Amino acid sequence: ALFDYNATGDTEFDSPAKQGWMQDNTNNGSGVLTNADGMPAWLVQGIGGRAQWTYSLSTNQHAQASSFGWRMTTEMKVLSGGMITNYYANGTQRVLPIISLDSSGNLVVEFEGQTGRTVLATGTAATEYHKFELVFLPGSNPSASFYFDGKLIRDNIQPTASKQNMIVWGNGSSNTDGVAAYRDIKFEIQGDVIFRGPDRIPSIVASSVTPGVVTAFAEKRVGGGDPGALSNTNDIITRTSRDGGITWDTELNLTEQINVSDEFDFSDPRPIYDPSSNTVLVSYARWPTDAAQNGDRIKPWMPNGIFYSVYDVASGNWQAPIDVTDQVKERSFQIAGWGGSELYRRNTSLNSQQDWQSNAKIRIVDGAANQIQVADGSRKYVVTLSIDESGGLVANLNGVSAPIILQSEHAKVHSFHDYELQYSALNHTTTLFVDGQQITTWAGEVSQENNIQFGNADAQIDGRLHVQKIVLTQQGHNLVEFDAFYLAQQTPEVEKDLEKLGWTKIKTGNTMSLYGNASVNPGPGHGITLTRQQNISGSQNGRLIYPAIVLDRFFLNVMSIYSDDGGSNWQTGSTLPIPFRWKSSSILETLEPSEADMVELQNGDLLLTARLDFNQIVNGVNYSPRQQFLSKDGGITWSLLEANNANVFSNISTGTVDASITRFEQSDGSHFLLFTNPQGNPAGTNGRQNLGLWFSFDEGVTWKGPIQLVNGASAYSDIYQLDSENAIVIVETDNSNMRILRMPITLLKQKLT
Ligand SMILES: CC(=O)N[C@H]1[C@H]([C@H](O)[C@H](O)CO)O[C@@](O)(C(=O)O)C[C@@H]1O
Ligand SMILES: CC(=O)N[C@H]1[C@H]([C@H](O)[C@H](O)CO)OC(C(=O)O)=C[C@@H]1O
Ligand SMILES: [Ca+2]
Ligand SMILES: [Ca+2]
Ligand SMILES: [Ca+2]
Ligand SMILES: [Ca+2]
Structure with missing residues (x-):
């Protein structure tokens, strides 16, 4: 949820009071809208009194903030004085950055619970507008980091004791004079629930052509549980946001119109965002309602297949489901x-x-x-x-x-x-x-x-x-x-x-x-549109692709399902190469890759990370619960990357579970990879707890992290870049409730090294 103030002259919202904030001054404290800077801003006048604005939160909101984190962003310029306090207090503690100009005019910052000061700017810069960011990450030992104009200033800021309960900005002192002009204030509580359990299996993508448009998906599980159960009727649901994932429209059931008698279960929404047409193409599997992938119950004579639905980002309209089963099954x-x-x-x-x-x-x-x-x-x-x-x-x-x-x-x-x-x-x-x-x-x-x-x-x-x-x-x-x-x-x-x-x-x-083949299934997560294939023989830019799960009869493996014509016609690639061995000339020992995710590397090679279900040891070699693969031909064939398995992810959970991987490109052109998966609690044990975030700055050779994003339950997740500075994450948490996290990647990466 977002609590904010955007300075404007528009009458209806020409004051913080008209934007949800409560005035909290004392004595001579005051304020007024100022335009002397070309762009309107609210001038906090704390001369001879306190001058601040506050926002109250509920018990549930504070709890959400503590378990999923929060962040406060301020765009302001300090004119004079000190005790410019923009912070958040939850009734028990607070992280308090105190901004001021010293006797020499330098802009500086101090932190309650911390000794000393840090000079942020000097000269004319000291009294110009700047962007201040305060990011709080959840955990057993939660801390906050302070950034000045995008640069990490103070990390691991410990919360200090306080009885105050409110979001505050302005000059928080009756005795210390302080004057500052604010262009914008934004306090965001992470973790809003977008889909509720027993619904499960989240995926998400965002538009680059229309910044702010985000489409999320999940499985509507009436009766709960995995597809194939007589006790449930599962469908694909989706919600769209047009403001960066802050507010969402009505939950929409995309498959009930092709499930008029509840004779099927639909699963694994695998969306792909295509920049060339500014559309989202989501593929999903169909199953008879009483037989599916689990237990190899599904059979070739049964209605399993793959369908897709198209979303027009510009007009915001979905299109009816299209069956492509004959092309991929x-x-x-x-x-x-x-x-x-x-x-x-x-x-x-x-x-x-x-x-x-x-x-x-x-x-x-x-x-x-x-x-x-x-x-x-x-x-x-x-x-x-x-x-x-x-x-x-x-x-x-x-x-x-x-x-x-x-x-x-x-x-x-x-x-x-x-x-x-x-x-x-x-x-x-x-x-x-x-x-x-x-x-x-x-x-x-x-x-x-x-x-x-x-x-x-x-x-x-x-x-x-x-x-x-x-x-x-x-x-x-x-x-x-x-x-x-x-x-x-x-x-x-x-x-x-x-x-x-x-x-x-x-x-x-x-x-x-x-x-x-008994069945084909898109698998959980999102797919991608290739754009660095110019030097990959047999491939092409514009290729839509995702790593699907195929069951021949008893064994699961992964294969690419792709389209070289925008999603009208689909083709399948070869299954992943995996070791096999016959013990005593009778017992088959092999791997069963299932839920996978892929990303396109800088040179056009495709890096795939897959969950390894059931047997994971072949001929004395333990492949772990996760294994990475590489394709040098646009996703047609793959190669198992030696020693590139669950172990490259420090402190990752030891239990099998779906993960997510994606590319992040900054405005300067640089890029790196992002990966999400539970860390377990304690980190490194088997358990769907504490979602972590890993970074790869070398094309998937090594990973740095993880940075804990969630404190508590964390199962399936999916991450996607929102804009040049943020990534959006959807993750299953308490009772599988799927929550939204909007992480400042360009800031967090500075906490690594
Ligand atoms: C950020 C903050 O907590 N400031 C608080 C101040 C400071 O504690 C003192 O001015 C010491 O600097 O005390 C008040 O009574 C005040 O002056 O209005 C309440 C205000 O909220
Ligand atoms: C389509 C399907 O049933 N997949 C299910 C998956 C599967 O059983 C496992 O990957 C073994 O193949 O398990 C789980 C799970 O939370 O662990 C959730 C999925 O709904
Ligand atoms: Ca129905
Ligand atoms: Ca069912
Ligand atoms: Ca996934
Ligand atoms: Ca089997």
């Missing part, structure tokens, strides 16, 4: 030949004396030894697909030494392609077409086998391929038809088992196969 049969081999063979009776054709729509997730083959009783034709050292898609044909480079652009390397083999009896050769394009012709190898086969063929060569369709034809008749795209979307009432459909499963070692 993969439907296929997946074979993970990681630590083994898994092939499916269907014996056939092809006639090598006549033409035959086969089609296989395949996507290579990773590795090699991924193949599709067809044998017709005379010759065998095998196409082996792999990812080379450069990350390109390569094909090798049996009997041909020279490998064929199919794709070099990472996005196309891991996308689905239609591999079509056309055998010509009269030419005794087979032609390979990829996506309708003729690639090469070869003779294969002599063979007596007659079949069609696909999968990962080598236990010593890791590889994962996803298939959407397989067909073999001859004489205009389909000999084999396997539509995985269709089957993955069917209920258990339909037969989907390859072995029951006529195929033979040939497996060795350890492998896993399954149908389509």
